[PDB]
């Protein structure tokens with residue numbers, strides 16, 4: 291992938307805020323459905339995603355565009371809403387983190403530019 295102003299913002303502003311949040315801990319690592327005794331998790335959730343995975347991807351410049359990274363964040367939250375019961379606290383935890391995600395995303399740089407300065 292590459293490094294852009296928007297990806298750097300997702301890494302150093304958005305991920306920094308979410309990763310340290312009180313509610314982050316269910317989302318800092320992939321779901322281990324074997325240890326949790328949930329054999330239906332991977333039948334229902336076809337694209338697992340978590341903040342540990344996103345953070346590693348950002349660290350390794352996996353993304354080409356901030357929108358791909360935002361889609362991983364979105365997939366993470368959506369998986370939560372799809373699999374769990376509407377009244378579960380983890381749903382309100384996801385909704386809390388997602389609102390911060392959106393509020394932080396609103397102040398992201400407008401024009402995506404690769405953070406690169408090259409000798410022609």
Ligand SMILES: CC[C@@H]1C(=O)N(C)c2cnc(Nc3ccc(C(=O)NC4CCN(C)CC4)cc3OC)nc2N1C1CCCC1
Nearest residue numbers: 315316317320321322326328331369370371373374378380
């Ligand atoms: C998968 C379904 C749904 C969901 O979407 N995600 C993301 C999820 C992510 N993580 C968890 N749960 C746990 C996550 C990590 C741990 C953990 O680290 N446990 C330690 C084990 C060793 N020892 C040090 C003591 C504690 C324990 C968990 O069980 C509560 N649950 C999740 N749920 C919930 C499933 C039960 C209600 C909803």
